[PDB]
Design a protein around this ligand. Structure first.
Ligand SMILES: [Cl-]
Lengths: 222, 223, 223, 223
């Protein structure tokens, strides 16, 4: 078992949102097979963040997805080489956040290097006014395109009693040769990302559960 | 299930529109169980046949009265009757197509009446839609949430094209024709769909089957 | 030579929905096709008072009236007597999307416009739905051929107090003449200044527009 | 024009990034007249040569100090010195590619120093960028407007591919490193550009020339 039922996580993230530079460091832990994980994040440069960390939380880990129904596991198959991902997230009120990430494995420790770039968040919107209240659960659509795994997702940011919708466009690339990977079929991945604590716009505690699965609806023969 | 909506309902659908300058009209005859969330429909292109594009793009225009609602989720669509409801959609395809739709849903005794108008443009002339090379839809999960008396939907849809998929994006709004005070809005939730094309002939006759369920996420919440 | 005159009549029939709100309106206008200037008076006959800013409909209301400089071939004036159509998607950076399609025909000295609009997802508290906008800045469209179809892209800026809300035009213009019967222009620009001169009770609007097709004014270097 | 900024300035540029996973670094030396709005630059690819993609997508990353300002439009960029300014851009290509850039502009005596970091992805493997089959940019017209103390820009760019064009869209923000209270913001205006690639060798050496002018619309405004 190259992955253990308890893993450490170390994350290094930097970037800008509406021109505001930040750097933070995360340390976390999780069970890759149960699909559960947590992370503590400290903003070491650019604190206090003048925007909602909610927009950075989904940049902070698909080794920790519980795979059901024998769905091949693109991410766990990628080790020891690891994998990368790229995402564009569009917010319906104008914000755009791109991110790219490198995932590597050193012994018991997964290591994440993330670069983010957010632009055009409206100055009076809930992101820049820092008035959001976490994410709803979501369900990602996942499917192969050659040797690359593609993802699409609708996410809903809680803003008071209403929602601000954004759209995920993600590509996951293995550092293993496509020859040595068994790609999944089309499937879904459920997520529930929770922010358990936040302090002074410089400290955040995350928890995430994730499950890969097929549609629950029966398929009518004909 | 003994009142305005019963365990077996009939459906009549009238659709017309233009896609990439190609005019057509369709009529649908269908039936289903609105409480079990299952339904079928037989569609005949009555004008503009053979369709010079994949009927797949029109199938999701062809019925949310037939959603099985779990976990006591308020049912926006069933609550709307006898008056009924309307819906509108903008769909964007990642290779350029854009399809817009207006729909009205009315009741006539045991029969639901659907009146749909669609407009599509910018579908690539050599893409799978205009070349009629798609292979039906994958199942999907819509995000459903209220916004000031209106029900909103968002969905990622995946059209099968050989071994690959072409992605499109639904932006849907649902409006009741009942007075606003008489409706109990749901909260944020999901609706699963599986839309299947069971028969097609001559780019003129199509047969659909659909199951849908409204529900919350199955994932536990960490306290 | 001929067909179009120094003064033309314009009649416009427009209908559609914005955020579910249906409206119909009728315009009568006039202009000088060769000077590139025109005006229109618009009466909302159904759905008044409009619960949204008519600014978003004003660019749906006429490219026969573009002054063509530097001998740029005139796709629109060449299209008569047959006429032409256009299709546009406009995305607003705060979420709105407005599609429209239009038919342009010519009868005597009267240009006849038939427009259909479908706007969705305008934010309920944004300046469009709150009716708080203050007209358009001038703009410069990019215009270029793609196999007999004329394409257009434009950045538009809606004035909201002392700020701007940006939207993006994606336009396609199609002639009803055969491809062989008309000379396509090359890549070029079209300047616009659309002004709303009067508005009353969200049911009556007066437009004025000036437009010029031209090349970049910047010199071209050596190589 | 005898103080910090003179009629002849030098430029040194440092650029690095990855496009579709391909790492590169390049260095530029340039010069120009910031008041007349003309400049040139000779670029060497120092890492990752030969570039496996069209350098055209990087040329607009390679200088707003050299904009000729007309009609007394306040000059956000020249006002920022000696401290300088930064800019950021997101560019979306209609065939799928996306390019992001961060840039810092500083002053060293008579030399402007540019530090650029770029990230591009989703360019189609068979597209004109990754297959290196593009042919330079058309001229363009940027829309420039203030939002608080930040200058915003939007632009439609048209890359020549044979006799056709691939469109992309600029979303640019410009931020001054001089104190906010020391800045006179412009109003809404336009900036014309013409960026020309006068020389290229072995996908490793490139020569650019650029002219740009800030102005208002040429169209008269109505009573
Ligand atoms: Cl706190």
């Amino acid at each position: 078992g190259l992955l253990k039922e308890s893993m450490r996580i170390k994350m290094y993230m930097e970037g800008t949102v509406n021109g505001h530079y930040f750097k933070c460091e995360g340390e976390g832990d999780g069970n890759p097979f149960a699909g559960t994980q947590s992370m503590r994040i400290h903003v070491t440069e650019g604190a206090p963040l003048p925007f909602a960390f909610d927009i950075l939380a989904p940049c902070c880990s698909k080794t920790f997805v519980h795979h059901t129904a024998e769905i091949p596991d693109f991410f766990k198959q990628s080790f020891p080489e690891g994998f990368t991902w790229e995402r564009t997230t569009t917010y319906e009120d104008g914000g755009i956040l791109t991110a790219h990430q490198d995932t590597s494995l050193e012994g018991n420790c997964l290591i994440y290097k993330v670069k983010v770039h957010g632009t055009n968040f409206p100055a009076d919107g809930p992101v820049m006014k820092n008035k959001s209240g976490g994410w709803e659960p979501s369900t990602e659509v996942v499917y192969p395109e050659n040797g690359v795994l593609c993802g699409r997702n609708v996410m809903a940011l809680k803003v008071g009693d209403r929602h601000l919708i954004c759209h995920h466009y993600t590509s996951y690339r293995s550092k293993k040769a496509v020859r040595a990977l068994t790609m999944p079929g089309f499937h879904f991945t459920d997520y529930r990302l929770q922010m358990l604590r936040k302090k002074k716009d410089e400290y955040f505690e995350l928890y995430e559960a994730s499950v890969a699965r097929y549609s629950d609806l029966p398929e009518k023969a004909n």
